[PDB]
Amino acid sequence: ARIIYDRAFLMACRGKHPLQNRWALWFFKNDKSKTWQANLRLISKFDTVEDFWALYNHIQLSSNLMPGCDYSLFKDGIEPMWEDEKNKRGGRWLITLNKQQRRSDLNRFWLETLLCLIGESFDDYSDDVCGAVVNVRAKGDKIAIWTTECENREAVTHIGRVYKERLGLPPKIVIGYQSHADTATKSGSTTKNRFVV
């Protein structure tokens, strides 16, 4: 049966409990002097609650929020690039933060996102999750959960609705899901949402 942990349980393990999946933490800086492949660093992998927290504390203590960086947590064997076989037919639920929310909501929202991933918070639809990405940017931070198949409406919408609930966002505040094939095309200031919740 699926290994599922709620928020209370994961927090109680913080200072081994196996995860349903093994996960890989990646770092990317968009340094145009280097190829995208050189810019992409695997930091670490883990598959227990306790090893997640040890890595979290180490990255949080030893940390940077340099704009232009990205951190990504993805299931083992999935590259954090939309061209991966497990991402190319998929998309993302995107949370856009305003500049003030860098100080108030970024750390909390990112952590809540990470807990939804490792705790398998979306029931059978947790299998559709590929990973999550935070883009640290001067103009506004972005957090997203990447899923494998943009045509799996039931899976995608369940993920969005639960994610929204776990973030504690007001029902007024709507989140969009965008297919990666649409995000990849620059067609103006906005990318169309395939779904909203």
Ligand X SMILES: C[C@@H](O)c1ccc(-c2ccccc2F)cc1
Ligand Y SMILES: C[C@H](O)c1ccc(-c2ccccc2F)cc1
- Report the binding-site residues for mRNA: 36-37, 82-83, 137-142, 185-187
Q: Which stretch binds ligand Y (CB under 6 A): 57-65, 82-90, 177-185, 189-197?
A: 57-65
Return the exposure string of 134-172: e unless at least 16 CB atoms fall within 10 Å of the residue's CB, then b: bbbbeeebbbbbbbbbbebeebbbbbbebbbebbebeee
Distances (CA, A) of 48 to 81, 116, 193: 24, 14, 34
Q: How far is the CB of 170 from ligand X (least distance, A)?
A: 24
**Stretch touching ligand Y by CB under 6 A, among 5-13, 54-62, 138-146, 150-158:** 54-62
Looking at residue 58, its amino acid is: H
Residues 6-45 binding ligand Y (CB under 6 A) are 25
In a 13 Å sphere around the CA of 45, the CA atoms on its Cβ side amount to: 11
* Distance, CA of 191 to CA of 114 (rounded, Å): 25
Q: Does 71 bind ligand X (CB under 6 A)?
A: yes
Q: How many residues sit close enough to ligand X to count as binding (CB under 6 A)?
A: 11
Contacting range for ligand X; rule: CB under 6 A; set: 13-21, 50-58, 143-151, 188-196: 50-58
At 106, which helix (H) or strand (E)? helix 106-118
Site for ligand X in 1-30 (CB under 6 A): 25
Q: Which of 56, 102, 127, 137 binds ligand X (CB under 6 A)?
A: 56
Instruction: Answer yes or no: are the C-beta atoms of 193 and 178 closer than 8 Å.
Output: yes
Contacting positions for ligand Y (CB under 6 A): 25, 55-56, 59-60, 63, 65, 71, 73, 114
